[PDB]
Amino acid sequence: TVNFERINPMTNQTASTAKAMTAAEARAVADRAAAGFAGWSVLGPNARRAVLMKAAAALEARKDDFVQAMMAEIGATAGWAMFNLMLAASMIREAAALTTQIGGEVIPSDKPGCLALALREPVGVVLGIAPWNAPIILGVRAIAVPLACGNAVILKASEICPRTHGLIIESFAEAGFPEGVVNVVTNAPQDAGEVVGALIDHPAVKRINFTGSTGVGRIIAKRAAEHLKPCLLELGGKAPLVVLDDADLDEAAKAAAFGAFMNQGQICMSTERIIVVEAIAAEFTRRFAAKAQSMATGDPREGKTPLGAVVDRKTVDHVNTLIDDATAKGARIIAGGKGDSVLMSATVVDGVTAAMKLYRDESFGPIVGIIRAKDEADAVRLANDSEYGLAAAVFTRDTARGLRVARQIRSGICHINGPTVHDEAQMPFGGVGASGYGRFGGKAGIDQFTELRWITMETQPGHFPI
Amino acid sequence: TVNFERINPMTNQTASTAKAMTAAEARAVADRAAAGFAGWSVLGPNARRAVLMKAAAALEARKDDFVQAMMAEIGATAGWAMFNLMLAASMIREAAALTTQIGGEVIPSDKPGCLALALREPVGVVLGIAPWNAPIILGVRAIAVPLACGNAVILKASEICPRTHGLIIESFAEAGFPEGVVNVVTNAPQDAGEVVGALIDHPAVKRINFTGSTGVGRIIAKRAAEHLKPCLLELGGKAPLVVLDDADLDEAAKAAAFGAFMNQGQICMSTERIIVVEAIAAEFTRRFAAKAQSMATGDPREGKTPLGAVVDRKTVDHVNTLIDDATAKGARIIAGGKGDSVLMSATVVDGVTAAMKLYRDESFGPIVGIIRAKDEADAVRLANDSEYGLAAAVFTRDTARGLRVARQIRSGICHINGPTVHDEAQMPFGGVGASGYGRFGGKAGIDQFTELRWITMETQPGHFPI
């Protein structure tokens, strides 16, 4: 009996503990999922919908356990935890709504009398690896539509929030899924490679969805290639927000502040780079600096400030390194600055250049860089000067120009006059380049967790050339 | 100036020669494709359709060069070459028909006034690696829908039929595509790893489609994972045809003979395993043996027989080994037999068991093994006793039972009362397991060669929580 612990970042005392599973124990979880698949996969759409609706209600019934777990494990505000619970429950109800919408197509054939079908069928066991930053939302995203598609699931819980992720599986356990359909795997950080490797290698595991860093994503894709397993990879992001000469500067500053500092900038689509054309750069910067200065940081347990704590000291040191590298290379701090605790200030760095680590590196903290563009063509080039391509935004009162710019930006997501932080269960969500491939949400999500099969039936005798 | 050659399997003289490109020359082809992409990607659907229709007519205009090239390079009959030409031209016209059908979706949003789009956009350069067995069909499949989707393409030609594949690109060159939109890469077999590796690593190459062996597919998938590139992998298989107790035995024997021996069994979906329930095994075997015995092999240049030559001596030695092995372990030879030349007989081995090499092996030659099943449940287990899962077929007069069996067979394709050999451009085509993932054809094919983007436009001011 071996456990690992998660230390509370606000108190430095144990927040929670969980089983440090071995590769053998993780394989036995996949064997239980493999055995539960057959029964669950043949259940009708209304019966499947009814179980998923019970899971959403059971998730909402564990509200007190979820708020305590998120606040203790990741240093979240009670508001961020309630937002997580609310939206996670809505995503389960969207997955329940989709069961009668997962079907197929009838395609006309040139073979006389041939009835030809393209059917979307359940695959088997889906492995869902979820991160800690929006833990209920992303733990639920890793398994909801996979379950609605008739698959058994393994939620590979984050070592940063094992209780928050464990509570998702305990909520689903009250809904009445058959035995072995919903499962959890927990592991110590040092065993991640061997435990995740053993699950990817397991013959019953047919689809892998992973949300996390590009570096770990590439390791997962290489391990999956060894057994020809398809992956849905939601990786890093360095979201740019472009401000053109006719942008509503008040609206751009409000959208940029919300996108840069929501959840202390710990979101895959947080605003990392603000690219402003020279014509309005001084005015935008003044408005944005004043807005970032008005957003206070405070103890998340008090619930009185827009910003709470970052996940741990590693983020504090990484953000401080990015600030020191930037200012040593000529950049200027125009809001916030370096911090000595997890209660970090909303920081704005002006004069960010290609020589600085902050221009390219994913900060995952409450820091944003302002980059100067000469004109629209230069702003597009700067927005595209990144290996990443998850979310992006463009601000302009000429929305037709916003569409021309969005078409040139290389990203999976682009919001015209909206913040970079935005997601809805019915929308396809994913990246290009180093941000990965595949999409969660809507019809694209269904395609990721079903097997498309060409099934035909003859109604006449065949006419063979030989 | 370095060339490789292809030797004619019927005469043992040079059939053709082609440039043995280096990794540097292959990268320069990808640079030309990258530069041609922008212009081609913004062309309207009717203008793109008109160019593709000219490509189909230019393909048909080079008929004499295609028939000579296929017969000389792979030992094909003029019939197999004309069939390849006819169907490849039809697939280009299907790709031309799809240009007005590649669009997007408008999805309702919970954000007031937000117009939300899910757009399928051109990706960039598509690398399409095509094999030699149905060289015009597969060479065209590797690029036709990728071109309709507004991408530039690189056809990575087979070293077994470099002139047949080179003629596809010369036909497309007559259609009026912009410069750098259609390209070819040729390489000596020993340079495949370095040339294909250099193209997969190239930043402009955004999608890879590969048709070939499982072993090479796994190498391609790992190389693609290093740069997070999505792949479409069609990796062949060991197609089972199941004959149940109420099957129309005459129809099953005709479909099995056509599927086992078309193109001398050198098709990814050729019938490799016939699984017969004991109730009708003796009668099916008699009918099938009589049918296989009536299918003669002859010199493909004479054009008087249903079977021509196998691609080379390697196949002859491999099929002879499968016969020696099976008959030494108690199998029965009921049609054909061993050969001393590329003109191989249509061979049928009965009483095949898991102790014989013919039970799991991909033969890619004119040989099929008959496996005895106790009943329907045993036949399903035997059909699924393979790492492969591309095509399969089930014969039964009870088509509802055919559907129940097809649902249990693990494959990307299943034909009820049809042969295992069947493809149509509008149908999704691909495998599961060791047969790969992704699908060519229909709407699934379009999704493989487009980038799905979530684009939104606000029509009201935002309401931000911070």
Author numbering:
A (entry chain C), B (entry chain A): 5 to 470
Paper text:
Gene-targeted assembly was used to mine a novel salicylaldehyde dehydrogenase from an Alpine soil metagenome. As a key intermediate in the breakdown of some aromatic PAHs, salicylaldehyde can be oxidized to salicylate by the activity of salicylaldehyde dehydrogenase (SALD; EC 1.2.1.65), which is an NAD(P)+-dependent enzyme. SALD belongs to the superfamily of NAD(P)+-dependent aldehyde dehydrogenases (ALDHs).
The crystals grew in the orthorhombic space group C2221, with unit-cell parameters a = 116.8, b = 121.7, c = 318.0 Å, and diffracted to 1.9 Å resolution. The monomer shows that the enzyme is a classical aldehyde dehydrogenase showing the typical α/β aldehyde dehydrogenase superfamily organization with three domains: catalytic, NAD+-binding and bridging domains. The biological unit (dimer) of SALDAP is formed by the oligomerization of two monomers through the bridging domain. Although the EDs were good, protocatechuic acid (PCA) was chosen as the ligand bound to the active site for refinement as it fitted the ED better. A hydrogen bond between the para-hydroxyl group of the ligand and the Asp427 side chain is indicated as a black broken line in Fig. 3(a). Although an NAD+ molecule was not found in the cofactor-binding site, the potential residues implicated in the interaction with NAD+ adopted a fold quite similar to those observed in other NAD+-dependent ALDH complex structures.
